Design a protein around this ligand. Structure first.
Ligand SMILES: Oc1cc(O)cc(/C=C/c2ccc(O)cc2Cl)c1
Ligand SMILES: Oc1cc(O)cc(/C=C/c2ccc(O)cc2Cl)c1
Lengths: 116, 116, 116, 116
């Protein structure tokens, strides 16, 4: 899988389930153009965002709707959402995992980048 | 101080020094309007962004230029930058500290919110 | 898998490979008694630590040798190692994932706890 | 201050107040010998652990009683506590800040190490 997103929950110690995720790619004129979207599964993961064909060198933005996740749980959190912006594939094709660990007032993100 | 930003560096175990920071506030028409900016000091901190007078109820965006920090150090990092989006003062005036801990492929952010 | 350990690397954005892990369980006399050990695979993961039979209610300690990982890479890190201490199965059998994200001067740990 | 400890709370977005902290130093025979202790103040901080005189080159262990903090708040957390083990002053005297960000099922720690 060229690109995958995992969301964990640090308050309950569980996967973050059914979290909406939106991906954008910067167009050649400096505008954000819609690239993919989905909701996280039961194990906090979202696969099949894209293919190796269409996942070319570029700047991408991953937006995770953290606010909606917390409210659905009865919690009013701090952040409107969490976004990860990064250059991809600028040194040949890699497989990417964007992970995020969430709390109401904090979040952490990391990327796992491997050569297939 | 109504609003303050601290940046730490997890690779060297030090403050993140001279990091550019930009703050925006959402205008009544859903556009991001420039609110404040600065660079972090020697202790990784940025004070005097605003005053209690002008820091009213609203949605704010704090953008930290992580990429430029790493490059100035001879490192090519993963993220273009880091941004924190949050509602402020929706329950009366609070003092806010936005903290970020950085690594080339990861970052963590939290908010310390206190009642003065 | 009743218990599994994943180690990621935040400086290179990759799995932490071949990291030694030791697990202890507190004995009925308040002493740490050896329970299991292993090294992380290529995807930063360590499976087959134990079985559901022997993984009973108790206090466990997971020790990750972070120091040795960094040195093998040519880095002198801050911590001697990282340890996670937790009660397990005190409310019936759960599956546990202990995750750790590492940098030379920082680390983060979380647990994913699910009901099978 | 040669050594200081700060504890933050990621569920409430506040300092972690009145958290017990214990420091040990490894003795020349490989045993942990009691070095200092305290409770965090209202701003989540614990100062005056030691002096530059007695804070010599060595391996130290900082133990933060996270469990007691959460229970006092009406929360049953995952970890028994959090401990940071590190070598100090092996390259001349430094000032150390050990920071920890806590959630019931997760915690993060970093060190800020500066040359005075
Ligand atoms: O690919 C995987 C799988 C998993 O089961 C957990 C993680 C956890 C990552 C993590 C992220 C941010 C942070 O602050 C701490 C951690 Cl441990 C990643
Ligand atoms: O106000 C202060 C002062 C300080 O000296 C350190 C911190 C550290 C915060 C922190 C942030 C993110 C993370 O993942 C871990 C931590 Cl410990 C905050």
């Amino acid at each position: 899988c060229p690109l995958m997103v995992k969301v964990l929950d640090a308050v309950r110690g569980s996967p973050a389930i059914n979290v909406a995720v939106h991906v954008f790619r910067k167009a050649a004129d400096d505008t954000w153009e819609p690239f993919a979207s989905g909701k996280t599964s039961e194990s906090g993961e979202l696969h099949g965002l894209t293919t190796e064909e269409e996942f070319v060198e570029g700047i991408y933005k991953v937006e995770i709707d953290t606010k909606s996740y917390w409210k659905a749980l009865g919690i009013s959190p701090f952040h409107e959402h969490a976004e990860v912006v990064f250059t991809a594939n600028d040194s040949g094709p890699r497989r990417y995992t964007i992970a995020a660990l969430l709390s109401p007032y904090s979040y952490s993100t990391t990327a796992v980048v491997t050569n297939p």
